[PDB]
Paper text:
SthK has functional similarity to eukaryotic cyclic nucleotide-modulated channels making it a bona fide model system to study specific mechanistic aspects of these channels. SthK also has the same architecture and similar sequence and structure as eukaryotic HCN and CNG channels, but unlike its eukaryotic counterparts, pure SthK protein can be easily produced in large enough quantities for structural and functional work. SthK has a voltage sensing domain, a pore domain, and a cytosolic cyclic nucleotide-binding domain (CNBD) that is connected to the pore via a helical C-linker. In all cyclic nucleotide-gated channels the connection between the C-linker and the CNBD is formed by a helix-loop-helix motif called the siphon. Interestingly, a proline is located at the end of the first siphon helix (Pro300 in SthK), which is conserved in HCN and SthK, but not CNG, channels.
Here, to overcome this heterogeneity and understand what the structure could look like with only one, defined configuration at Pro300, we solved the single-particle cryoEM structure of SthK P300A (all-trans Pro mimic) in lipid nanodiscs and in the presence of cAMP. In agreement with the low open probability of SthK P300A at 0 mV, we observed that the majority of SthK P300A particles (~90%), adopt a closed-state conformation (3.4 Å resolution), similar to cAMP-bound WT SthK13. Analysis of the major, closed conformation of SthK P300A, revealed that the siphon, where the mutation is located, has a slightly different conformation compared to WT SthK. However, the density in this area is weak, making a detailed comparison difficult. Interestingly though, the density in the siphon region of SthK P300A appears similar in resolution to the density around it, indicating less heterogeneity than in the WT channel, as one may expect if cis/trans Pro300 was contributing to the flexibility. Overall, the closed states of SthK P300A and WT SthK13 overlay with an RMSD of ~0.7 Å indicating that the structures are similar, but not identical. In this alignment, the cytosolic C-linker/CNBD domains in SthK P300A are now globally displaced by a small amount from the WT SthK structure (RMSD ~ 1.5 Å). This displacement is a rigid body movement, that brings the CNBDs in SthK P300A about 1–1.5 Å closer to the membrane compared to their position in WT SthK. The structure of SthK P300A in the closed state reveals a previously undetected conformation of SthK, which we hypothesize is what WT SthK with all-trans Pro300 would look like. Close inspection of the interface between adjacent CNBDs reveals subtle rearrangements in the closed-state of SthK P300A compared to WT SthK, raising the possibility that this energy could originate from different CNBD-CNBD interactions with cis or trans Pro300.
Numbering used by the authors:
A (entry chain A), B (entry chain D), C (entry chain B), D (entry chain C): 9 to 63, 79 to 412
């Protein structure tokens, strides 16, 4: 549903309202004007979200729900006790722990952590500036100019810049300053770390592939291999990057279980299926057993697949590329094949050698049957086995 | 035991006492008041821990135990020789090397390194501030205000902020300042590095899973596959994340040896065990041989497991989900199965085709027997083999 | 082709011209002198590149092509509206997205990202300094001295140094300063992250190898193994690092498909091929079947390969190193073999035990046949099988 | 040899002398006193190392050898031309590229890179401070106090601290300052990156093991397994960490080739070898064939290995731990076995069931024979096969 979503958003806005008012009031008690209605509404939202959640871990919600702030603000309390209203916070923890699940997949987790941290940083800067322009000699100056200098200071401190135009004078100012410096250096170490971890995973494939190619190459040069083969290999890896980004079909489809892998394979070879069982008569238990045995392979341009005098024994189904057939030795082409078709069948149904030569024309992406396996699951079905003659 | 633990804690507190007194005294010799008893107790603790340890590597303990400080403090020594009392340190090395083993597993090692580094940082700041408010023109000012400005300075320096409100005047001040700047830039590089390494390993599974899904998807789109199958795959991966966090059963149980793997499997299928060998009569050497051959598999909602005209030859044991049985083609359901039950048995004990259809209702988590293996270890036990008829 | 390349370079230079003039003019309207021709040429280049691209994603090109700047500059517009000329930017996005593909392989992607980021940084510094020396009390000072102080300021800010020699005075200055501080701390976090990710992948092999050796060693010492064997192992790993950088032949050649792997293997063992089939008569279907079964192995100096009383049954082809033959027990050497040669043949074609002993002399890199496989694919070809007698 | 080593060290010291004198002279021409002998010696060392190297890449050595500095220093040259003496540098590149190989293995490569970078940093700081105290109004002040302030400045700049006590006044000063700021921010990004990469690889095993345990656990809890088995598993992983640091024997010994693996295995089971072939009569071709088939396994305390009514068919050799034998059901122990011994033999040489029960007493580390393999390579040797009766 969405009501829980909009509700959590309302809780977020409420805790923001509190995080921003609480301290600004502790400094400027001239607020708490006929503006308590919003405080009451927010307290009600929190005390009405604590049960929903029920529909250690719940300790923050309990500490945030009770109005430990309305008292201190209504009945004037002194400086060291006027604090403890911040207990109305600690709901930000629940907010983060909720929105890290509501939005746990659609975006990188590191990015989400980074944004949360930045929000936390800015709220803390707002609180720290309030604390600073509290620890200052009282003067007659507008509250919009006392708050600007404080934000300027705490941002030059948290940022590790430190101009030096406005500095501590009294000791307590100095202790506050020390603590803020440490939190800034500790708040600036987290940002950099999250960012580094976020960029160290952007270009993964374009690094894995690069390392794999470097490995292959650096290994071949030790074997003192010709540059032509090196160039063929490099072209192969380029073609394998600019289509599927470097991934191998088998290792991938192995990450899936049997039914989904079968459905994939049956959505791939569907065309071939409507080009084989036409005059055969089988189906639904034979097509589904070989299809998991088809192993892929890629033949570059000009590479020989089948020669006119061998006994390969296998059969090849094309999926993407093209192919040309030729005579044994006179480079005369019978025809040209393309996707969907198939060849290598005779030497399977029949134990004769090959009758022609097969040379590719461009980068193929075809599949093949070992025939030890294909002939093994044919014997098991004797009807088609008789159909082959 | 715990006596060694509390003892190491006492040694830690003692070396802390020394790290904090040693320099503060070197600056303020007005200490060394009738406060030597604590120094004697700590020297005794160190000289009494050096033998326990015995119950290069031991060089620091030897240099820390001898009272090279009590002399210098008792018999007044000049400024360049009043040093060398810090030899009482170097016990922090033993402390770190001990507590990195006492607490080596219950918490992340990087976190522990980070906390140790921060403690080392603060102690060094305390020492550096002492050194600074030594290298200052002598004046009549309280010692609590001379120590605050020094800590403020060295924290603005180590932090890489550098306001500029208090700076070096004399040359030796300037050399001290240079060294502190370098140590700060070298002390601030370690913190950031530890933090980055600590956040680069929080969300591991939620990154491995994400990359695996991106790979699968980006590979399928190249094969021009329908979006329905893509959605089924995504739902599968979601269900596989929100239960076991992305981990595969086989790859995991493979990280264990044979006895623990067997005990696991026998705690899992225990229910099935009390639903099979009832009227059989076997046990303790047959149940324990098949159980290691049960391979898991997951069938999504609506996926066909068994059809009314095939010869699957296998048998399926359910563990978590549910299932429905149906006729061949008229979508009439005989009954509904749930966890603990089993089906697919007839075509195993008997070589007939299937008699019905089996379609899942929700995400199953079931197990299956190949039957090549099951029928192979049945033949080996001829008694049950006759029991099957 | 190259015309598209030089064209994209021209587009890059044009968008640079704009990024550098646009703001410098907004500050110094005394420009827009008889210097509009270059602006017209650049607008034409952009409006003429938008169609080529055609030969969301295209939104930036559309916003950059229309002359939303020529109006504002021709007809004088006020300060808050004189902006929006920067819409002529956003072409840098297309520039980056184009040059990240044009140069996606020849250099590390991280390095490219880093250089792009640095360029973006410097352009932003140029814009920010213009913005700063706009938000300054008007004075009579040369424009080359007002622009230097601004660049100095924004570089001391973006860099997180913050001397403090020139600072904000007015509030709007202060808000600008806050924003620049945040962007600097956010612009300095990206640089460090990219750099860390760029150095964390330089020494990969020299780290993988090191870890593998540490693992092997630390495992052996637990088994209380002699140091001699440890030294032999270390020498082996050194020799395996200083030739092929730690990579194993099989795992590597497995990253290739069958045809390229076959061509590799046939370029390697080519010499052996012209030393075997001389008096045999086979070829093109037997040489090509065993060659994929040759498994490599490395024998250190002094290691026994074959002893005079065993029945190894295998045959060894040498590729790089040398070897010595010897009698059974009297250390008398018959001859010495080197690369290209072969031995171990008799016990293959004949089922007698070995006749001599074979000890290496230096680090060999040889290959061997199991003979279960070699004798299996020989039977399949009965002609040579009769040729062996 | 070592002469080349000491020679490279001399070259290093010479290029250091030059890097430190060259600029300090360019600033203080009052040097070049009767101190030219050292310059001549260093030029000779460089011009005499250029040929040794011979016993693009050599361009730096050629540019460093010719005395492009002795002229400028002898015949007074003006300020913009008095430069180009730094060409005597660029030998540091050869120094780094040499010492990165001389010391490429004994220490982590990242540490070495870091130290090189730090040295480069300090030399650059020395040069930059010279350049700075050149770009200063000439005054009457000692050269040891003009050089201290410059080093202080450039270290507060390179470090990203920036106090602000001494700043640029003139424009050229300001441009120098800008460049130094960028180099510092670019010199401080490299240090942090190297450090992060150096700490991200310290605790590898103690992280891999931790992740593996988290995976196993988090997977079991989903299967709702008892806590007793969980505790047994945790104890197993602890014992497996505190002996061999988490590494598996098979995966490790698989990183070695056949001869070294054989020699390892024959140094391990050597005791067993002198406890088996005593009354047998075999050797050197039977012991060496089974030893590679022994598979390891670990049985925790109290785990049953063999029960008095099964037909395990296998045999177990102990290596480290202990074991107890017992009757079928009355917990009466016949004897107690320890390392070196063996059991499970009868049911191998004979096809009877087991005669007793075997329960471990502590963490064992034993090995076992499948017996399908052991009985297969026994048949091949018929002599011992008759010896078994
Ligand atoms: C995000 C969390 C961070 C947000 C914190 C805001 C606190 C600011 C409140 C400042 C109110 C203090 C001002 C005040 O009470 O005025 C009377 C004088 O007080 C005075 O002399 C003394 C007032 C200055 C001393 C400030 C101490 C801060 C106490 C930290 C408590 C919460 C920390 C953790 C929150 C999650
Ligand atoms: C993000 C962009 C935010 C932009 C925020 C724009 C806010 C611009 C308002 C200026 C008000 C100036 C009026 C000055 C009134 C002066 C009269 C006065 O003394 O009023 C006081 C109350 O006011 C006051 O404490 C009011 C002064 C403080 C108001 C500042 C609150 C901004 C919170 C910052 C959140 C950052 C977190 C990210 C006492 O009775
Ligand atoms: C954590 C370790 C870091 C903690 C170090 C504290 C040393 C501070 C002691 C300062 C005492 C120096 C003050 C002193 O002796 O007074 C007479 C004047 O001295 C003077 O003019 C000169 C005194 C100032 C010179 C300070 C030099 C510091 C020597 C570093 C030695 C240990 C370094 C490594 C410790 C592990
Ligand atoms: C973590 C929080 C720690 C809070 C520490 C709170 C400490 C607060 C005490 C103030 C004392 C002020 C009294 C000033 C007395 C002035 C009279 C005087 O001259 O006494 C001198 C001795 O005192 C002196 O050297 C005493 C002055 C120095 C005392 C400061 C030691 C604090 C150690 C810091 C450890 C940080 C490491 C993390 C000479 O005879
Ligand atoms: C790379 C992108 C960053 C490059 C940005 C350059 C903008 C600088 C233009 C400055 C022109 C402002 C000066 C001006 O208009 O003069 C009249 C007075 O204005 C005044 O009082 C007020 C002028 C100062 C206020 C400056 C606000 C900057 C607005 C940011 C818009 C683009 C941001 C994103 C660009 C990709
Ligand atoms: C990379 C190295 C770049 C070196 C750049 C060297 C540039 C050196 C030119 C100095 C001009 C000094 C003449 C001063 C003329 C003063 C007379 C005057 O007022 O002219 C104004 C126009 O000039 C002006 O706005 C001109 C003043 C501003 C000129 C500065 C533009 C440089 C862009 C920086 C790009 C950095 C991005 C990486 C008004 O009518
Ligand atoms: C490590 C490499 C870095 C080490 C560089 C040291 C250069 C310092 C030499 C300074 C000599 C300049 C001083 C000089 O020549 O005096 C006459 C006045 O010059 C003047 O007004 C002008 C002198 C100040 C201008 C300094 C420009 C530096 C040129 C950079 C050249 C090498 C860069 C790369 C080296 C690998
Ligand atoms: N004229 C042709 N046009 C297209 N394909 C052919 C032609 N002649 C033979 N082939 C195919 O090429 C294959 C090569 O030899 P096979 O015996 O494997 O079976 C052959 C046929 O499938
Ligand atoms: N009426 C039924 N209720 C539940 N399960 C059934 C029913 N009829 C058949 N089955 C099971 O469904 C299986 C499908 O075909 P099998 O031959 O494998 O064996 C069958 C039985 O185990
Ligand atoms: N005199 C020799 N010179 C070179 N190689 C030899 C000599 N005698 C035997 N060999 C080879 O050494 C091999 C060792 O025993 P094989 O039976 O395997 O076959 C033997 C021959 O190939
Ligand atoms: N009394 C004994 N003391 C020690 N080992 C024994 C004793 N009796 C039997 N065993 C061993 O325990 C083994 C258990 O059954 P096996 O048939 O495998 O062979 C047995 C012997 O090797």
């Amino acid at each position: 549903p969405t009501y829980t979503l909009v509700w959590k958003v309302w809780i977020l806005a409420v805790t923001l309202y509190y995080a921003i008012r609480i301290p600004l009031t502790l400094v400027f008690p001239s607020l708490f004007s006929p503006l308590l209605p919003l405080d009451i509404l927010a307290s009600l939202a929190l005390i009405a979200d604590i049960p929903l959640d029920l529909a250690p871990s719940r300790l923050p919600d309990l500490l945030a729900a009770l109005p430990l702030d309305l008292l201190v603000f209504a009945l004037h309390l002194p400086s060291p006790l006027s604090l403890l209203s911040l207990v109305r916070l600690l709901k930000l923890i629940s907010v983060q722990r909720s929105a890290t699940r509501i939005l746990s997949y659609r975006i990188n987790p590191a990015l989400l952590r980074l944004l949360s941290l930045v929000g936390f940083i800015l709220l803390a800067a707002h609180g720290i500036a309030c604390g600073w322009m509290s620890l200052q000699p009282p003067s007659e100056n507008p509250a919009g100019t006392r708050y600007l200098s404080a934000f300027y200071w705490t941002i030059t401190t948290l940022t590790t810049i430190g101009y030096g135009d406005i500095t501590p004078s009294t000791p307590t100012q100095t202790v506050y300053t020390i603590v803020i410096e440490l939190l800034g250096a500790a708040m600036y170490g987290l940002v950099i770390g999250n960012i580094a971890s976020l960029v160290s995973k952007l270009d993964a494939a374009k690094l894995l592939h690069r390392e794999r190619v470097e490995r292959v190459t650096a290994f071949l040069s030790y074997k003192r291999i010709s540059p032509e083969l090196q160039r063929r290999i490099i072209e192969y890896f380029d073609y394998l990057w600019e289509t599927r980004r470097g991934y191998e079909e088998r290792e991938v489809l192995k990450e899936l279980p049997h039914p989904l892998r079968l459905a994939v394979a049956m959505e791939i070879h569907g065309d071939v299926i409507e080009k084989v069982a036409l005059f055969k008569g089988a189906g639904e238990e034979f097509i589904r057993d070989i299809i998991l045995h088809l192993e892929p392979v890629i033949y570059g341009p000009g590479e020989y697949i089948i020669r006119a005098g061998e006994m390969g024994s296998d059969v090849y189904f094309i999926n993407r590329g093209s192919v040309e057939v030729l005579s044994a030795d006179e480079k005369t082409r019978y025809a040209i094949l393309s996707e969907g078709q198939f060849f290598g069948e005779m030497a399977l149904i029949l134990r004769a050698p090959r009758t022609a030569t097969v040379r590719a024309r461009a980068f193929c992406d075809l599949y093949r049957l070992d025939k030890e396996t294909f002939d093994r699951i044919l014997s098991r079905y004797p009807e088609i086995a008789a159909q082959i003659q």
